[PDB]
Design a protein around this motif. Sequence first.
Motif, mmCIF file in Angstrom:
data_model
loop_
_atom_site.group_PDB
_atom_site.id
_atom_site.type_symbol
_atom_site.label_atom_id
_atom_site.label_comp_id
_atom_site.label_asym_id
_atom_site.label_seq_id
_atom_site.Cartn_x
_atom_site.Cartn_y
_atom_site.Cartn_z
ATOM 1 N N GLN B 54 6.730 3.307 6.684
ATOM 2 C CA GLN B 54 6.981 2.704 8.002
ATOM 3 C C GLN B 54 8.385 2.985 8.530
ATOM 4 O O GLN B 54 8.574 3.051 9.736
ATOM 5 C CB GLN B 54 6.737 1.187 7.978
ATOM 6 C CG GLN B 54 5.320 0.778 7.711
ATOM 7 C CD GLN B 54 5.101 -0.706 7.873
ATOM 8 O OE1 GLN B 54 4.837 -1.425 6.903
ATOM 9 N NE2 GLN B 54 5.192 -1.175 9.098
ATOM 10 N N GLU B 98 -5.183 -9.200 11.539
ATOM 11 C CA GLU B 98 -4.026 -8.453 11.030
ATOM 12 C C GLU B 98 -3.260 -7.798 12.188
ATOM 13 O O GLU B 98 -3.852 -7.290 13.156
ATOM 14 C CB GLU B 98 -4.439 -7.422 9.952
ATOM 15 C CG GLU B 98 -4.814 -8.083 8.618
ATOM 16 C CD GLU B 98 -5.217 -7.114 7.505
ATOM 17 O OE1 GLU B 98 -4.764 -5.949 7.484
ATOM 18 O OE2 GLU B 98 -6.010 -7.534 6.632
ATOM 19 N N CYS B 100 0.544 -5.308 12.553
ATOM 20 C CA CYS B 100 1.326 -4.334 11.797
ATOM 21 C C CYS B 100 2.526 -3.945 12.662
ATOM 22 O O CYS B 100 2.381 -3.712 13.881
ATOM 23 C CB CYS B 100 0.458 -3.102 11.452
ATOM 24 S SG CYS B 100 1.275 -1.732 10.551
ATOM 25 N N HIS B 141 -3.043 -4.091 2.624
ATOM 26 C CA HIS B 141 -2.482 -3.525 3.838
ATOM 27 C C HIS B 141 -1.381 -2.499 3.609
ATOM 28 O O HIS B 141 -1.366 -1.442 4.261
ATOM 29 C CB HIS B 141 -1.920 -4.659 4.690
ATOM 30 C CG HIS B 141 -1.334 -4.204 5.982
ATOM 31 N ND1 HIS B 141 -2.063 -4.150 7.146
ATOM 32 C CD2 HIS B 141 -0.080 -3.814 6.305
ATOM 33 C CE1 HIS B 141 -1.283 -3.751 8.135
ATOM 34 N NE2 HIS B 141 -0.077 -3.530 7.648
ATOM 35 N N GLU B 142 -0.418 -2.856 2.757
ATOM 36 C CA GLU B 142 0.789 -2.043 2.514
ATOM 37 C C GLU B 142 0.466 -0.823 1.625
ATOM 38 O O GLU B 142 1.006 0.238 1.859
ATOM 39 C CB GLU B 142 1.937 -2.883 1.851
ATOM 40 C CG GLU B 142 2.408 -4.089 2.645
ATOM 41 C CD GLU B 142 2.916 -3.730 4.039
ATOM 42 O OE1 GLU B 142 3.372 -2.568 4.262
ATOM 43 O OE2 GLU B 142 2.889 -4.621 4.923
ATOM 44 N N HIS B 145 -0.777 1.712 3.737
ATOM 45 C CA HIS B 145 0.377 2.487 4.264
ATOM 46 C C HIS B 145 0.839 3.622 3.357
ATOM 47 O O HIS B 145 1.224 4.679 3.853
ATOM 48 C CB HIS B 145 1.597 1.634 4.561
ATOM 49 C CG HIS B 145 1.529 0.897 5.850
ATOM 50 N ND1 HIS B 145 1.206 1.509 7.036
ATOM 51 C CD2 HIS B 145 1.785 -0.400 6.144
ATOM 52 C CE1 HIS B 145 1.242 0.609 8.005
ATOM 53 N NE2 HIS B 145 1.582 -0.558 7.484
#
Lengths: 159, 154, 159, 159
Positions: B54, B98, B100, B141-142, B145
């Motif tokens: 990110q 969710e 982000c 979620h991460e 990523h």
Amino acid sequence: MSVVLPVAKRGEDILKLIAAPVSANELNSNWLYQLADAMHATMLERNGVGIAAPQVYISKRVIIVASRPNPRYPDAPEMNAVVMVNPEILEFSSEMCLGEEGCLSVPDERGQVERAEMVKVKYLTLQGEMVETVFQGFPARIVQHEVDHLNGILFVERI
Amino acid sequence: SVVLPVAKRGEDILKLIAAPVSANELNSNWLYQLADAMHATMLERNGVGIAAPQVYISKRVIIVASRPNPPDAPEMNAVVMVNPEILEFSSEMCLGEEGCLSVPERGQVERAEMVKVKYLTLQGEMVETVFQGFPARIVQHEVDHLNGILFVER
Amino acid sequence: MSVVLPVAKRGEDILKLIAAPVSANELNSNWLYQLADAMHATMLERNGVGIAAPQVYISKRVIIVASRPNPRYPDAPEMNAVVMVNPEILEFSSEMCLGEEGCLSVPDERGQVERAEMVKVKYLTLQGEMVETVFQGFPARIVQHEVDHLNGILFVERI
Amino acid sequence: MSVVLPVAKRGEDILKLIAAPVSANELNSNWLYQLADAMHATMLERNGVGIAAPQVYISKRVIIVASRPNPRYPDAPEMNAVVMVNPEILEFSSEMCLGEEGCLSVPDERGQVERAEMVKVKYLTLQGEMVETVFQGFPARIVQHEVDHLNGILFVERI
Ligand SMILES: [Zn+2]
Ligand SMILES: [Zn+2]
Ligand SMILES: [Zn+2]
């Protein structure tokens, strides 16, 4: 707390991205100094004369130019190593030079690459000062090589 | 502490498989610093988690930091994971909203209610920890990523 | 075409004066262009990175600032040479850098000088147009060194 | 092309210096013709009969001797202006004369000054030919005056 970073190899998509500019928040931060120290240590370990952040999985506009004579480039000038933040090449000489190039991201494959003999270049230091400067010959070639990494380009795509 | 720039949906950095943190990087000031910046970046942006890609760093580091935010999520102590690996997802599923930081558009995601994750601390020690519920959704979620997956794709 | 002028040395009293301002009628004069040409050829022929009119016996406020890697200064950054007429430093930073210096006027004695890291200068081009430029680092040292020459100061007086 | 140079005035230190000899490189140079031309234009703008480089902030051994009849000096002879590079007076007559002198560098002070009536003098031309000529009377006085300027002497010190 002295780190040599894994290097990405031709094939891995990270080398094809356009790296993002370093932000104002990053300038004069331990974060950035530490990034730079790690890149530097990575370049020395290997024997490199420059390195770009994308090669160590950091998609950010930082490079190091650090020409020095070694068996591979006995004609290479001595220079104090220079960490460039957000470098832009402002001008290329139309005058060309043929150079011998290798990359840590293109293993067991070197070659001959046409580069501008002169470049004029704007960057920010690690403290965050605007700097403009002209490079000639081999350091000029090094600047064109690492800026290329920042725009997703490997030296083999210029042959 | 530094607030780093964050990449948005569309940017190709976010679609990659992040490289594993290597052994020499374990217990380095490089790494502590990387984590420190990810953490300040997360807190300042009211994120409940964050992943190295990110902020332009294609390395397998995530932070999981559930807390009530402007959301009403349960508070955990924040945990920094290096090379996280989810060894078991439960078949039991929870559905929640969710957001982000990379998708500034919200949505509803099917997630395993329980995950069991193995990871390295910043020092380099292996820890195995099970999560349930919203913290479990943050973990998933991460890790998405880290494998080039944004939450909209579910 | 161009001419290499004789250069004064430490001890010679011309180096100790306050140089006179270039007057309005000298601006955009062939006189002035020719003075600048001679000063520039003199500097280059002696591997100078800067030069000041008083060094060539001309007691006028004209300096050239021309950072460049050469045998006198092997690791110096490269700039386009800039000719300044009546230079005036309106702002010295508090940040000081320390570097080794030499003047063509002080043979076989280099030495360590404290200089402002940044200077902002207002000068007139040879045509007579006013310009303001900020310099950092070694180019900011050449600027301060040459203006020192225009006010009767050699770098040895600044240890 | 037309330029009138500012003139230094008594109390400014350029006029106390011993001007440095003009070098071999400067002979037959556009540098030197242009210097000479600006000195020549400066002398004429004021009705002067001679001039010395140091008066125009140029600490160099060039003078002009240019006698011509005037309201100030009627009966002063007609002569082609002669530019003298690195002049040395080889012989002074013991035969004294007393003339009225003034100097652009000494404003509202003129006076009466004792000079040798004959001088034998060598100099180089602007093309760099060695010359050796004798002046009597007023042109002899002008040479002694402008040579004095080269050795940092104003006419009032001869009173
Ligand atoms: Zn490379
Ligand atoms: Zn996210
Ligand atoms: Zn006079």
